[PDB]
Amino acid sequence: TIKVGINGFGRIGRIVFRAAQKRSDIEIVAINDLLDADYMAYMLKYDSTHGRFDGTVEVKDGHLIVNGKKIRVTAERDPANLKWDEVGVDVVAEATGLFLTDETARKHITAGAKKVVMTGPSKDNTPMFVKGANFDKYAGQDIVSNASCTTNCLAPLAKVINDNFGIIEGLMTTVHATTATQKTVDGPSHKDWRGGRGASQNIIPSSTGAAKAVGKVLPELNGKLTGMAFRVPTPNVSVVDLTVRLEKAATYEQIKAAVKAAAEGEMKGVLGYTEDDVVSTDFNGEVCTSVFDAKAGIALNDNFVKLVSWYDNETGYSNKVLDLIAHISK
Amino acid sequence: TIKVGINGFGRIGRIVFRAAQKRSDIEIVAINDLLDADYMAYMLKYDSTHGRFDGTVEVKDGHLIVNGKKIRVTAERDPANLKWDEVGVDVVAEATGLFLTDETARKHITAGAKKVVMTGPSKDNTPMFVKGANFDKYAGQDIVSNASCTTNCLAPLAKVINDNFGIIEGLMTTVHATTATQKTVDGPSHKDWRGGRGASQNIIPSSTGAAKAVGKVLPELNGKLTGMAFRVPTPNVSVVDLTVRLEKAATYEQIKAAVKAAAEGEMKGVLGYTEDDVVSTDFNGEVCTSVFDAKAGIALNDNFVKLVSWYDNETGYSNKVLDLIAHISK
């Protein structure tokens, strides 16, 4: 089993923890964040969005005993003072959103661990690997990024579509659920004015690097797609609205079949497929990072279509982070 | 002044009434609906979305006294027994959403009114007129429709874009605010399963005629546009996300300039233009049916762009309904 340590017990940090519980190939051994041990236990036991932790969790000696296994708990504002080696940590799930560059994240290896998986997109040249898009391109790097929730949703779908009919050009919009980055009421956001407005009262036009980021994980699409977002008043689960221009004519039935095939083979577990009358809450807890909504999309013609794909921006992404930890441990 | 009478005192009926107050060319003399006069007054005095009625309103003998002028209250299930002539009603604002056909809507002419204006898309062949798109095509018809809030937003914008650079094809999406047809918690919606799901908990993919309806008001675009909707948990203010491929190449700066020009001239009052970091609540009360958001849209290249336009699905549409009453009366 790969020994994992989590840095930053935010939403991603905690769901990565929860999802890791059902996997045998991995084990969380330590958690670092500026939070008491008993506070961490509370944030783990109860989840407004995901329900009560399915298992046992207790505080003993300022550390955690989750599901009977001991979890080293620390609190270092600095990543180099983490003695990961002491707890025998192989990979570190960098989930604080603070150390998204080789320079900063390297300190984990400096601090005693082998590899670092950033739970966010790289701020520098650190490679981004997205399951179902380019895991096969992993070249043994020791510091990697798993991109963002949105890219993990769009990347797989874009690959299928591009690979089967060829994407000439595409523009996407993601109707994204509220995040911890937003505000309850009109607050301060110096680098993003719209982003500061009351989250629950508005449809907030936002930006996203996903589309372009996809051009990096699937270079063949570099410069081919771009997009934006719309933050809406929901606690979790978002949807990508991909409008593309196809090279090869393809009926909607042909696109539904190409996607369903991937969802059932090469991309099983990453890409999902559905023909049901689903809504966002029907995916809260969804592990597939991209679930194609057959009935939701619309084709104007065989070369201009609109595709719709769901994703639990929390559970899906978090599970894949663990898929990447396993992959680079292969 | 055109003497008007409202049938159906739902959201549209009450907001058409409210906005009608500022117009000197129009007067509301009667309202029909299965509701007491004192209940009507309550629905008029207080609005969760638009605040308290700006003016006086009271009940005197099962009839309303708003800002002085008396309003004739009634409660007929069959439009034919409405005696509009008795109160001198020239045009009837059909807002029950129940009589969207000539045979049913005509029941108003029969009952004493000169003309009828459906506050929703026709269900038969009744002409649809949208301000800024084809008000000039009106040919004396005594029964007309004002299309939907979405079409009143999408139509003006597509005309500017089409008229300047020519729309080869396009696919839109509207992130629409919750409406009265939705449910508070998972309820029944026989003709639309998705639409029955709890409004406040989901992003609900919904259908829309808007795009295909624009093909009717602006025939030149017939079969060239289509789209869908995403119903989000907000009380009011929606936005259209239009992705188009243009014939004549146009930089985003050329598109912003074409729209801004239309808004300051030929389409002043219908089309708006903003370069501010706005959100949906910034348009609650917006009279312009289509407000171009310059900073929100994005162009991939000079022939493929994503355009964003806001609209208060209540106040804007309601205002244009009165605009159509004044028009067909001119």
Q: Is residue B24 within 8 angstroms of chain A, CB to CB?
A: no
| Residue B286 neighbours by CB distance under 10 Å | 20
Substitution target from A202, A221, A231, A279 for chain B, most B beta carbons within 10 A = A279
- Pick the catalytic residue: A29, A113, A149, A217? A149
Q: Closest-CA residue in chain A for B233?
A: A233
> Is B31 assigned to a binding site?
no
| For B283, nearest residue in chain A (alpha carbons) | A202
Q: Is B186 left (phi over 0), alpha (psi -120 to 50) or beta?
A: beta
- Picking from A202, A226, A281, the nearest residue to B281 by CB comes out as A202
Q: Resolution of this entry in Å?
A: 2.5
CA dist., res. A36 & res. B164, Å (int): 62
Structure tokens belonging to residue A223 = 């410069």
How many A-B residue pairs are in contact by the CB < 8 A criterion? 132
Query: Angle CA(B315)–CA(B317)–CA(B319) in degrees, nearest 5?
Result: 65
Counting beta carbons within 10 angstroms of the beta carbon of residue B238, is it exposed (0 to 12), middle (13 to 18) or buried (19 or more)?
buried
Distance CA(B107)–CA(A116), nearest Å, equals 73
- Rounded distance between C-alpha atoms, residue B290 and residue A49, angstroms: 36
Round to whole Å and give the CA distance between A30 and A8: 11
Q: For B30, how many CA atoms within 13 A lie in the half-sphere containing its CB? A: 23
Helices (H), B208-330: 210-217, 252-263, 315-327
Confirm whether residue B315 is marked as ligand binding: no
Look at residues B141, B147, B98 and name the one whose alpha carbon lies nearest to residue B122.
B147
What is the tally of helices (H) and strands (E) in chain A? Answer: 8, 16
CB B119 within 8 A of CB B93: yes
**Elucidation technique:** X-ray
Residue A203 and residue B301: Cβ atoms within 8 Å?
no
Q: How far is A201 from chain B (nearest CA, A)?
A: 6
Dist. CA A299–CA B152, nearest whole Å: 23
DSSP B47-113: -TTT-S-SS-EEESSSSEEESSSEEEEE--SSGGG--TGGGT-SEEEE-SSS--SHHHHTHHHHTT-
What is the CATH code for B148-313? Answer: 3.30.360.10
Which residues are registered as beta bridge partners of A73? A31
CB of B185 closer than 8 Å to CB of B175: no
Cross-chain residue pair B173–A170, CB shorter than 8 Å: no
Q: Which two tokens stand for residue A291?
A: 């679930």
Tell me, which fold does domain B1-147+314-330 have in CATH?
Rossmann fold (3.40.50)
For the purposes of burial, counting CB atoms within 10 Å of the CB of B285, is it exposed (0-12), middle (13-18) or buried (19 or more)?
middle
Contact of A158 with A221, CB cutoff 8 Å: yes
Q: Is A171 helix (H, G, I), strand (E, B) or coil?
A: strand
Closest approach of chain A CAs to the CA of B152, in angstroms?
A: 20
Instruction: With beta carbons less than 8 A apart as the criterion, state whether B313 and A203 touch.
Output: no
> Which spans in B230-314 are helix H?
252-263
CB neighbours of A199 closer than 8 A, spacing ≥ 6?
A178, A182, A183, A184, A231, A233
Strand positions, DSSP E, chain A: 2-7, 26-32, 57-60, 63-66, 69-74, 91-94, 115-118, 143-145, 167-177, 204-206, 225-232, 238-246, 271-274, 290-293, 298-301, 304-311
Q: Are B259 and B160 spatial neighbours (Cβ–Cβ below 8 Å)? A: yes
Mutate to test the interface with A, among B206, B226, B277, B291 (most CBs of A within 10 A): B277
Per-residue exposure over A21-54, b if at least 16 CB sit within 10 Å of its own CB, e if not: eebeebbbbbbbbeeebeebbebbeeeeebeebe
Do residues A101 and A122 touch, judged by C-beta distance below 8 A?
yes
Judged by a CB distance cut-off of 8 A, whether residue A249 touches chain B is no
Place of tokens 């109160």: B87
> Does residue B131 contact residue B270 with C-beta atoms inside 8 Å?
yes
Whether residue A169 and residue B298 make contact (CB cut-off 8 A), yes or no, is no
Angstrom distance (rounded) from CA B328 to CA B2: 10
Q: Which amino acid is at A52?
A: R
| Distance of residue A294 Cα from the nearest chain B Cα, in angstroms | 11
Question: Could you give the 3-state DSSP secondary structure of residue A261?
Answer: helix
B136 burial type by CB count under 10 A (0-12 exposed, 13-18 middle, 19+ buried): exposed
DSSP for B105-149, please give it.
Answer: HTHHHHTT-SEEEESS--SSS--B--TTTSGGG--S-SEEE---H
Distance CA A248, CA B239 (A): 32
Taking the alpha carbons at both ends of chain A, their separation in whole angstroms is 11
CA dihedral A181, A186, A190, A191 (to 10 degrees): 50
Q: Does residue A149 carry a catalytic annotation?
A: yes
Is the distance from CB of A271 to CB of A290 less than 8 angstroms?
A: yes
Both tokens of residue A207? 């930006």
List phi, psi (to 5°) of B57: -160, 130
- Taking each helix axis from N to C end, the angle separating B11-20 and B37-45, rounded to the nearest 10 degrees, works out to 70
Helices and strands in chain B: count of H runs, count of E runs: 9, 16
For residue A247, which of A291, A286, A202, A302 has the smallest C-alpha distance?
A: A302
Residues in chain B, how many? Answer: 330
Q: Look up residue A161 and give its DSSP letter.
A: H
The answer to whether B30 and B113 are in contact (CB under 8 A) is no
> Which residues in chain A are immediately followed by a break of C to N over 2.5 Å?
none
Residue B103: exposure state from Cβ atoms within 10 A (0-12, 13-18, ≥19): exposed
Q: How far apart are CA A176 and CA A227, in angstroms?
A: 13
Q: Does the annotation list B148 as a binding residue? A: yes
Of B193, B238, B298, the CB nearest to A227: B298
**Chain B residues inside the 8 Å CB shell of A171:** 243, 298, 300, 304-306
Structure tokens at A306: 């609109």
CA distance B3 to A328: 75
Give chain B positions within 8 Å (CB) of A182.
none
| Chain A hits for B238, Cβ within 8 Å | 203
The amino acid present at A8, given as its one-letter code, is G
Point out the residue among B232, B237, B239 whose CB comes nearest to the CB of A233: B232
Handedness of CA B232, B236, B237, B240 (dihedral sign): positive
Dihedrals phi, psi of A200, to nearest 5 degrees: -75, -15
Residue A212, min C-alpha distance to chain B (Å): 11
Q: Judge whether B171 is closer than 8 Å to chain A, CB to CB.
A: yes
Q: What is the rounded CA–CA span in Å between residue A164 and residue A175?
A: 26
Annotated catalytic residue, options B149, B199, B229, B262: B149
Cα separation of B197 and A273, whole Å? 21
Nearest-neighbour CA in chain A from B172: distance (Å): 9
Residues with Cβ within 8 Å of B110's Cβ and at least 6 positions away in sequence, in order, are B79, B80
DSSP A184-201: SSS---TT-SGGGSBTTT
Report domain extents, chain A. Answer: 1-147+314-330, 148-313
| Cross-chain residue pair B203–A234, CB shorter than 8 Å | yes
Which residue in A has a C-alpha nearest to residue B277's C-alpha?
Answer: A194
d(CA B124, CA B101): 5
- A232 vs B224, B233, B241: nearest CB: B233
Q: Which site among A183, A194, A203, A255 would you substitute to test the B interface, given the most B Cβ atoms closer than 10 Å to its Cβ?
A: A203
Positive/negative CA dihedral, B178, B181, B187, B188:
negative
Nearest CA distance, B197 vs chain A (angstrom): 8
Alpha carbons A119 and A112: distance in angstroms, whole number: 19
Residues present in chain A in total: 330
- The Cα–Cα gap between A213 and A151 comes to 7
What the block records as the tokens of B263 is 């808004």
Q: How far is CA A6 from the centre of its chain?
A: 15
Q: Is A111 helix (H, G, I), strand (E, B) or coil?
A: coil
Q: Which residues of A touch B237 (CB under 8 A)?
A: 203
Chain B contact for A122 (CB, 8 A cutoff): no
**Nearest Cα residue in chain B from A308:** B205
**Known binding-site positions of A for NAD(+):** 11-12, 33, 77, 119, 313
Closest CA to A108 of A330, A326, A325, A327: A325
